[PDB]
Ligand binder design. Structure first.
Ligand SMILES: Nc1ncnc2c1ncn2[C@@H]1O[C@H](COP(=O)(O)OP(=O)(O)OP(O)(O)=S)[C@@H](O)[C@H]1O
Ligand SMILES: Nc1ncnc2c1ncn2[C@@H]1O[C@H](COP(=O)(O)OP(=O)(O)O)[C@@H](O)[C@H]1O
Ligand SMILES: Nc1ncnc2c1ncn2[C@@H]1O[C@H](COP(=O)(O)OP(=O)(O)O)[C@@H](O)[C@H]1O
Ligand SMILES: Nc1ncnc2c1ncn2[C@@H]1O[C@H](COP(=O)(O)OP(=O)(O)O)[C@@H](O)[C@H]1O
Ligand SMILES: [Mg+2]
Ligand SMILES: [Mg+2]
Ligand SMILES: [Mg+2]
Ligand SMILES: [Mg+2]
Lengths: 144, 441, 434, 436, 426
């Protein structure tokens, strides 16, 4: 089997190029949920789901967008022509920066929503409760 | 639930009145008044929850509403009452014995509603101050939307905080019983601080209300789930993989004792359910002998059985039986019978199916479908409805008519015409002896 | 609140130095079978015999399972009773013989009675007393370590031996801790802080436990119940931890295995040693194999061999068959389903069919158990059907009649409800006709 | 290109109104069967009904598999189509029922789309910074890290969490290496070394890769078609974990297990939620079971229950025998070897045998698709032979005829080549005669 | 490939001319003119590679040359082309379903050639200088027949050379991309030219090998251990679509091969049903099936069949029939066998062997050659004479004589009813 390692490396390299490009992370989209029972709790998961911060993202996006609307009202006819003025170029750069930060907030909001939606089928608290050895302690345990 | 229009998609439940009197058509069911009364009596028996381990047999000709009656019972039961519907052939496994498969099916049909009491403190940590030489001491501040309090931290609490690496702006939860610290997430004010975020990070709001809260939560767990969890060290994975093996009998006895203790202490409630076995005639004599004793248990559920065979041969034996089932099992079973439908009932069923499939039938097409159903079969016309709809749509006509149904009848055969054609040309189809004339000239 | 098929069977209802009462303990009739079960129960309580077989022979609806349950109830929950159906033997992970042996050793039980002296209480004083060194050397020596424990209506100071210092260090106890120290072993164990110091810190991870009651010195007798199967499985299983064997055990799901005779003999030897020491007592128990007709000839041959084992329980078998061919054989027609070799080793008890009065009494007692009220005419009709079709048919029909009566706002079952249930639910015969 | 038995079948060959042409799409004849299959294809494209079943009944060499493959071609490569034969259900790792269920959920495709943002380029700077005050944190007290990435269109300076810095250290990334960061998950990948530093050392083992095209920060929408069975397998045997136990389990063989109904229910819940949100779309496919005669009575009984489910594809069955006792049963003679209860849930599409003209046209088309030239006389001889013994015999005898013609340096097959092929290669009837 | 002498060692080919006409005796094959012509047609079809999913049945009486014909086809087909030969009894496994075993056999016979271009430096090492951090400074010198230059190492190359602990004066091979180092002895051999050469290495794998490689984390061990398991069908679909894409790209070529099932009369009806459909799909190899029984009951069925095979499969196959040999062909086959076994038979000895083979069996006369040689060697004689063959005949019995002895003494053997008379008396 030592002589076959080169063949294995070649085949894996051939397949990885196609494998990596067009795949969707099922873990990111919470389609895989069998590991969550090990490190997550039911009430904690539901509290995190209730405590999501979508509203703050939406309100900040709207605030930035209305600031951009005011800036566009002040600027007037925006254009991407070659720049010959410091004022015009600076205002255009500010506009593009604000659009970029709006997009960043939107993407962060989606990521946070997907990350806080994670839940376990059985919380580790449920596993502990169903596994606990009733009320038996070492006080009445048999040494024999 | 993710679903498409299916065979029994129109049954919302048994159309029973307050006095368990069936309506002529209600909740998607037509006719079978006596059978629906019996099903309602069984349903009320399940709902009462006192009677344990009763076997019900549903008998009648094929396509007469047996599985429809079971679906109606399941819909009337609703959620919070377990209902495990399995086939006769499902119990045969290469990993589990037949008795183990039946035991797991029985335990799946009983649910345990367990209450766990948790006391927690949740809030966004505002400031942390730790002094260390001797043992360390420190003070910590946690705020809510309408409260703020400073707490003093012990040495072990400080050790836990350090091993969790908690910083300001983090929303954390502490169980005052054990002192375990769980990091819910970060505040929104820290979101701007980075361009890319790690996998662990989450942004959450500050919790409202009082800092310290008491809450009780009810969990619905079947007996089988408790057995699997308490069998191995990671049985909850077997609850999904199915590689559970034959659970020890002593484990089941321990779980029964534990559930009894919980029920006495009042933290667990028993919600018995219905086990439905489709095509029970595919079971073996060993399975029936196990079922006979399984029903004689305090935790045994109510078993519904649907069979259509008359005097047939029980599997695993060399003799015939009244329903394909041994006399001992029939002795401990009450029988609900079904009756063949007349023309009007078939017409109403076809109308309901057409409505569910959003197909606009015409009166003449409905009459033709009813005639084909009474002549050949109900399922044949029910399946012809959608094919006729597709043919009509291909004809750029939004309603189905007699021509579309006639074309559907011509294209797609039924059992009788197929038998006639196979008998007329026996030489071109393979027989039991294997002879076939592929040649034509 | 739940009602299975044998909730009313509380026992055999015999009287001391007497016979079976006509109606007592939920049993109606079956005097001879109840007396035979009583003498068998006496034999089991004697706990001096092994491999004794009784066969409950009779027709359907004759009380066989009720008799087995009555034996179980009469013996009490302390005697290990192991209900089983013959179909259960056919496993997929192991051979039938292994499963039969596991059930056999699950029927045998062991009771361990241990008395232990313990001092418990909050630690108040911790002072070592200096003493003269036998070897001199100008070193500082301690002859005792003084621990003062306070309890509810009790407190004492102990001059323990100097060895306690190791256990105190290992358990990192402190003043205010409540501890558990064994009198003869010398070990200590802390269960938590005293509740009196729960206010000293607002937050603390450790659990504060209430101060133990009674005198500091407490003598407790702990009784534990185990079965030979439990010991065998525990000895055949890895401890479970960070060692590599436990890791591969986590990887590979634990299937049933043929536990070797060497392990079983080791378990027997250690059990015998501790029984001779006077700490353990042996309880034979009962192994009930219902539907013995389902067993194959191989299982019957292994029963023939295993009944001769020097340690074996009392096996109760039940069969509703007459002259039928033994499973796994082509021409062995034997009484019941049991092959003649095993029948020669057992004792048979008959279960007779019932009369009209017995059926009526059974029906009325069952109705009382199900918290139902029935009219006399309804009871007579129910008994007529019971003698006409089956006893179990009527016993099961009781509940739907009650549901129908409750739907009609009535608190009693009447003949109309009985006939309505009869029309709704068919029996085996009327359905076979249909 | 290789020429399989059903390469010439390109489609059902129907008109816009549903009528089937006499010769189109590689098909010859079979008008009624083709029209029925077209209606079924429309029903599949409707994506409304679950558990509908049809059975293609006909004699051997009639076109059942041809019609099934025509349905698959007409639906396209974006709709599931899982071929099967009755013998493949009899596995040795799990019960046949579980195999049937796995095949059922292998034909319900789901199209799930996810928007992903990636930072990629060549590392130019890596300047970890500590907190402004030592008391701010614990131990190392590492604050954000600053990384500079370079792309074909410019450079960008990123501010990263300390977790990303730990990932960078784990992947052993130095200045000049081309890296790849996923903002969706925070995963750092080392593509390789930049071609800029290719000649820094004359002998070094480094996978030199070019500088990434486009901007450093590119946002792309990724769409994948995954079956529900893929999600079930992912949940049953997750690939996560870096523990010793996790790796040891990875090395173990992937034996099939009875995936519980609970896992399927949870998968359906999450998929329904995503379909409601618009993230995913459902594509009911088609399950094809050829040689349905080989199924046991237990498999048919379980099919009765499976076909009544809320999510079930369109199962198409093929049977080439009539009035045959069902496998696993002693006495139940059934129409097509299929139990009567399953037949009541089916729609039978009868396919009819061919005449001489259809066989001749089929041989013509097969010779054309095989890149072989056949003379008219030899082609009539082949048609007579096929109507004498079987169509498949002639269709398979075409190739040795071509080889024989080539051995004589002839461009086209002559009648003598066909005669020599007959002499060299026999048929079933002639073999039976010669062995008798 | 050192091995002893088998029963098919003499068959080195199918013995055809350019026009596919078989010669009377060539490449170790004698007679069977039509069978060899048809086998040559099959071989040409395999070499063309444009035809997929063809089944050929090699039927005929026993000891006629079916396995010999298959061996000749395999040898004439040569290497660099898959040829899987499995007996029909190898399908029945406790770990693989019969359909899965047949699928793996089918995939084993389709080969895929992948070319990998690697940059490797080959030469004779002279000096190595490695220094501590001033991360690491290193220089190596490689001498060849016409160059001698130093190379400035980097960190990873230094680590690799230290791990290998390469000495001086030994021929070494270093790969620029992979970084693998292959050691060779001191320069019999010597470096032959430029330091850095550009030579491509081709890897021959089958579809089954790719499937098993992708099956697990380290699945390529299963190709030797045999614990592959039933591979998921989605994995096979992935392999198929990637092979189609690679062939379109031109970075990998497919070499269709031949699958040979020696004893098809042992497969059950499920296996034949699977084969019927497996032949239809692309990537299906050419299946050769050898059977001898005239009319028998197919395993798993209660009815007879024209060859022990269901009529559906026979409709899909073309049958090559082999005919029994005559005296002259038996003589020349025995001469070939004797030449292979290094036995010098006399003319009269060969004639006696030929008459014995015609009367009883060709295999029986073939086996008697070595026993006769050993008998002659006990007499210190080189050539095998008639009396040696006669003594071999007397000492060793054939089927007919053994049957005659058993029939004439049926009492002293155990019969079907389990009776025997061990007692010599009464
Ligand atoms: N003597 C009895 N007194 C009161 N109830 C009885 C008596 N005998 C039987 N029963 C009840 O009648 C019902 C059926 O009897 P069982 O003993 O459980 O069945 P069985 O007689 O063992 O027949 P098989 O072998 O199980 S089919 C149960 O509810 C019993 O509690
Ligand atoms: N009383 C009824 N009301 C409404 N629909 C019915 C009724 N009886 C049967 N059906 C319909 O007829 C179809 C046949 O189902 P079913 O009768 O359960 O088959 P079987 O009884 O043979 O298992 C089902 O789709 C069911 O919805
Ligand atoms: N209508 C048709 N037109 C052209 N070729 C056909 C037609 N029907 C069948 N064939 C050819 O005949 C052969 C047998 O088809 P197939 O469907 O595999 O057989 P069966 O119908 O017995 O399953 C196939 O190779 C196919 O190309
Ligand atoms: N045409 C042939 N030329 C040379 N040797 C042959 C030929 N046919 C058979 N043999 C020899 O006869 C022996 C048995 O033949 P075998 O392959 O077993 O045929 P079958 O499998 O039909 O019994 C082989 O060792 C082979 O060397
Ligand atoms: Mg049904
Ligand atoms: Mg009983
Ligand atoms: Mg076909
Ligand atoms: Mg051979």
């Amino acid at each position: 089997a030592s002589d076959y390692k080169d063949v294995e490396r070649t085949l894996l390299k051939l397949f990885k190029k196609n494998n990596q490009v067009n795949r969707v992370d099922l873990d990111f989209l919470n389609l895989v949920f069998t590991l969550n029972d090990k490190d997550l709790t039911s009430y904690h998961a539901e509290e995190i789901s209730k405590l999501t911060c979508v509203k703050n993202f939406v309100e900040e996006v709207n605030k930035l967008r209305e600031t951009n609307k005011q800036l566009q009202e002040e600027f007037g006819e925006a254009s991407f022509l070659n720049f010959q003025d410091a004022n015009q170029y600076f205002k255009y750069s500010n506009k593009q920066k604000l659009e970029g930060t709006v997009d960043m907030l939107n993407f962060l909001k989606m990521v946070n929503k997907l990350r806080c939606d994670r839940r376990p089928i059985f919380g580790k608290n449920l596993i502990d409760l169903l596994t606990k050895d009733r009320r038996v302690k070492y006080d009445k345990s048999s040494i024999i | 639930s993710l679903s498409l229009i299916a065979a029994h998609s129109h049954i919302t439940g048994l159309g029973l009145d307050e006095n368990l009197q069936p309506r002529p058509t209600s909740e998607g069911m037509v006719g079978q008044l006596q059978a629906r009364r019996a099903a309602g009596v069984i349903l009320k028996m399940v709902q009462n929850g006192t009677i344990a381990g009763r076997a019900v047999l549903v008998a009648g000709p094929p396509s007469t509403g047996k599985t429809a009656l079971a679906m109606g019972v399941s819909q009337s039961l609703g959620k919070d009452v377990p209902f495990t519907a399995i086939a006769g052939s499902e119990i045969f496994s290469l990993e589990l014995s037949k008795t183990e498969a039946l035991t797991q099916a029985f335990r799946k049909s009983i649910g345990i509603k367990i209450k766990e009491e948790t006391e927690l403190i949740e809030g966004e940590v505002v400031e942390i101050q730790i002094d260390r030489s001797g043992h360390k001491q420190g003070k910590l501040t946690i705020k809510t939307t309408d409260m703020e309090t400073i707490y003093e931290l012990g040495n072990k609490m400080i050790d836990g905080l350090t091993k969790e690496k908690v910083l300001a702006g983090d929303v954390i939860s502490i169980d005052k019983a054990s002192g375990k610290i769980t990091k819910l997430g970060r505040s929104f004010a820290r979101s701007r601080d980075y361009d890319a975020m790690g996998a662990d990070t989450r942004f959450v709001q500050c919790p409202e209300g009082e800092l310290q809260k008491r809450k009780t939560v009810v969990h619905t767990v079947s007996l089988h789930e408790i057995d699997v969890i308490n069998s191995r060290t990671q049985g909850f994975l077997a609850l999904f993989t199915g590689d559970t093996g034959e659970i020890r009998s002593e484990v089941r006895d321990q779980i029964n004792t534990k559930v009894a203790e919980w029920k006495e202490e009042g933290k667990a409630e028993i919600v018995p359910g219905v086990l439905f076995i489709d095509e029970v005639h595919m079971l073996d004599i060993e399975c029936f002998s196990f079922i006979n004793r399984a029903l004689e248990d305090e935790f045994a559920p109510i078993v519904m059985m649907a069979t259509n065979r008359g005097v047939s041969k029980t599997r695993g034996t060399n003799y015939k039986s009244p329903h394909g089932l041994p006399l001992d099992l029939l002795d401990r079973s009450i029988i609900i019978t079904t009756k063949s439908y007349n023309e009007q009932e078939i017409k109403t069923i076809l109308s309901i199916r057409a409505q569910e499939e959003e197909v606009e039938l015409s009166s003449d097409a409905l009459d033709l479908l009813t005639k084909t159903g009474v002549e050949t079969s109900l399922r044949y016309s029910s399946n012809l409805i959608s094919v006729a709809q597709q043919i009509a749509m291909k004809r750029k006509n939004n309603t189905v008519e007699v021509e579309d149904v006639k074309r559907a009848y011509l294209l797609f055969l039924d059992s009788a015409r197929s038998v006639k054609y196979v008998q007329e040309n026996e030489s071109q189809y393979i027989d039991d002896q294997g002879n076939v004339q592929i040649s034509i000239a | 609140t739940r009602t299975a098929a044998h909730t009313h069977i509380k026992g055999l209802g015999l009287d001391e130095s007497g016979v079976a009462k006509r109606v007592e303990g939920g049993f109606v009739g079956q005097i001879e079978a109840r007396e035979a079960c009583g003498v068998i129960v006496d034999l089991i309580k004697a706990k001096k015999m092994s491999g004794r077989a009784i066969l409950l022979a009779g027709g359907p609806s004759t009380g066989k399972t009720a008799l087995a349950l009555a034996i179980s109830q009469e013996l009490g929950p302390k005697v290990p009773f192991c209900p089983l159906v013959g179909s259960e033997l056919y496993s997929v992970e192991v051979k039938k013989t292994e499963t039969l042996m596991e059930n056999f050793r699950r029927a045998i039980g062991l009771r361990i009675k241990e008395t232990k002296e313990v001092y418990e209480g909050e630690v108040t004083e911790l002072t070592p007393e200096d003493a003269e060194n036998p070897l001199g050397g100008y070193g500082k020596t301690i002859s005792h370590v003084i621990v003062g424990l306070k309890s509810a209506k009790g407190t004492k100071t102990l001059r323990l031996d100097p060895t306690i210092y190791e256990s105190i260090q290992r358990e990192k106890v402190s003043i205010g801790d409540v501890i558990y120290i064994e009198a003869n072993t010398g070990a200590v164990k802390r269960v938590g802080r005293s509740d009196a110091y729960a206010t000293e810190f607002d937050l603390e991870t450790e659990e504060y436990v209430p101060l133990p009651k009674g005198e500091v010195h407490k003598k407790k007798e702990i009784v534990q119940d185990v079965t030979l199967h439990d010991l065998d499985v525990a000895n055949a299983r890895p401890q479970g931890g960070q060692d590599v064997i436990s890791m591969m055990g986590q990887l590979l799901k634990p299937k049933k295995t043929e536990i070797t005779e060497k392990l079983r003999q080791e378990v027997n030897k250690v059990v015998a040693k501790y029984i001779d020491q006077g700490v353990a007592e042996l309880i034979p128990g009962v192994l009930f194999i219902d539907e013995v007709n389902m067993l194959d000839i191989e299982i019957f041959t292994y029963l023939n061999k295993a009944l001769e084992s020097n340690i074996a329980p009392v096996v109760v078998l039940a069969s509703n068959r007459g002259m039928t061919t033994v499973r796994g054989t082509e021409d062995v027609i034997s009484p019941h389903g049991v092959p003649p070799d095993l029948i020669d080793r057992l004792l048979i008890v008959r279960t007779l069919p019932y009369d009209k009065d017995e059926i009526r009494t059974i029906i009325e007692r069952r109705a009382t158990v199900e918290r139902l009220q029935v009219e006399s005419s309804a009871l007579d009709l129910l008994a007529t059907m019971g003698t006409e079709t089956s006893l179990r048919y009527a016993l099961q029909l009781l509940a739907p009649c009650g549901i129908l009566a409750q739907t009609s706002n009535r608190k009693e079952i009447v003949v109309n409800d009985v006939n309505e249930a009869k029309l709704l639910f068919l029996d085996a015969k009327r359905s076979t006709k249909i």
